[PDB]
Ligand binder design. Structure first.
Ligand code: NI
Ligand code: NI
Lengths: 162, 176, 176, 162
């Protein structure tokens, strides 16, 4: 029953990014076995700076990277760009009112990358965009982490008990 | 008993679905109480045709196992290299030669994705059917990640790796 | 208490030795009983000069820590790319600016190996010393394997990954 | 205390190869901690065929691949050759009487590889050479296994208890 908070953070002049792994969900079967019913994912939390070495997490914006989206990121060319579009209320009533776009791209003339999260949310009147540049080494740690975590998110470390 | 987990990974498309399930290696107990690997694990691919909007008819499914060596082929493929595998599910058994399955894995025409195509000729029941499914680049990358990850588990080396600490705790040298 | 393991990995050469030790991340208990990551792990490199035939003087050793981000640099290097890291062991402390350490990692001249060179200027004790060690291609490949392996452990993600099963056993959905 | 035999075998027309992982050794310290004192390694066991789908393991020859040698193999170019020379009695009295050479090379005009183990042993009057060709897929499984096992052989999975 041990529970771990192991967010990985990158702190820059104007913004911070925290990446938190989230476990898959399971359903109990009639037989007493468990079936994976939802994949794990990574929760990305972006916040603006508010003073030297501080960030305002009350103004955070979040974006969930799915297993397939992680697939995109680990298979990217060294200088390939990508973009992901989420409506958090697809298939619900509030559909269309919250729009989130995550861009991940190489930095211009540089060896690092940026992450940018824009969120337009009409339910709470928020229109926000947080940009954060990452060094090559920082990106390499992310990619190492993403590659490592993928099989765990789909539960494959957990077959083969016995 | 320890918990048993089902962790099928699925891709759902317009005309077909694919589910991939890992199957554990088998071991035997020895007289000494040691466990010997008796059968490698494998992956089971299950393909099913669409029956309406994002529903599939699993009573019409066709299946194909991927062995450790076939996974080796898949993980070592060039970026746009094709491969093809030929199976007789009853090879060496009495229905040998009755059923032939062909799995093709190839890049999509002028695209960055792949397809899997499973063709089955079953002469026991007069079935000659094929199921095709497209896989995006991102989806394929998840598959290849999973395949690379699972390979050492399928050959039992995980069990070795994870027995090291507990073993050291009982068998170690002591100073003089 | 659980067993504690020392697993230093060493390379011994003609004029110098290098030992690399992993250091675990630190966690804190929370009021809820949950554990929060409080400090990333790192690697400690310890370099020592030869004192005779394959003996080294560890009382003359110089050390250098590699952070998670520095390991990121190392694992992402081009095949013959150079890198260099600059440390002040007392940065932010009262001895800030007294001690400077530089680690260089570069390919060997017209060879397939690498060297590590650690230079230390310690103005507290009038020490200005450097230790150089050559690393073969095979040795470097072991280091890079180890570094890639350890990175998710150093950020605590292993602890996450390995808590999944046990957690599912208690928290899961039940049918209706 | 669970013990596993998980040899991985490749069986061909004239020869078989079995690869068995071997755990590192530890010494108990005064403090109750344990220190890694010998790296793990891989034991390669080669045997000649003796009839259809059978091999004579009484005529086996063996070669221990060290962590550094595994380093060589995982960092090889796609068609790079390598060779390893062992005297099993270096630093002992019988030094010089047993000579073993393992060659691993791409197959000529082919995408597979071969392993060849030659052993000249004057202590028991053995002069033997076992050659086995491996397919690209079979080699890819080996390399996957070798990459996977390396950090375990040096005990790195075992730091961070607590
Ligand atoms: Ni003891
Ligand atoms: Ni329950």
């Amino acid at each position: 029953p041990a529970r771990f908070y192991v967010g990985h953070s990158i702190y820059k002049g104007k913004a911070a990014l925290t990446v938190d792994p989230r476990a898959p969900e399971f359903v109990a079967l009639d037989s007493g076995a468990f079936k994976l019913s939802k994949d794990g994912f990574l929760l990305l939390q972006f916040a603006p700076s508010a003073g030297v070495r501080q960030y305002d997490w009350s103004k955070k914006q979040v974006f969930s990277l799915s297993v397939t989206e992680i697939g995109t990121l680990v298979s990217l060319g060294p200088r390939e760009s990508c973009e992901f579009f989420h409506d958090p209320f697809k298939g619900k009533s509030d559909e269309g009112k919250v729009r989130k776009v995550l861009k991940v791209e190489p930095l211009p003339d540089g060896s690092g990358h940026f992450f940018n999260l824009s969120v337009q949310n009409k339910l709470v009147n928020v229109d926000e965009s947080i940009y954060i540049p990452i060094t090559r080494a920082e990106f390499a740690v992310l990619i190492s982490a993403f590659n490592f975590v993928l099989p765990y998110l789909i539960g494959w470390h957990a077959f083969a008990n016995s």
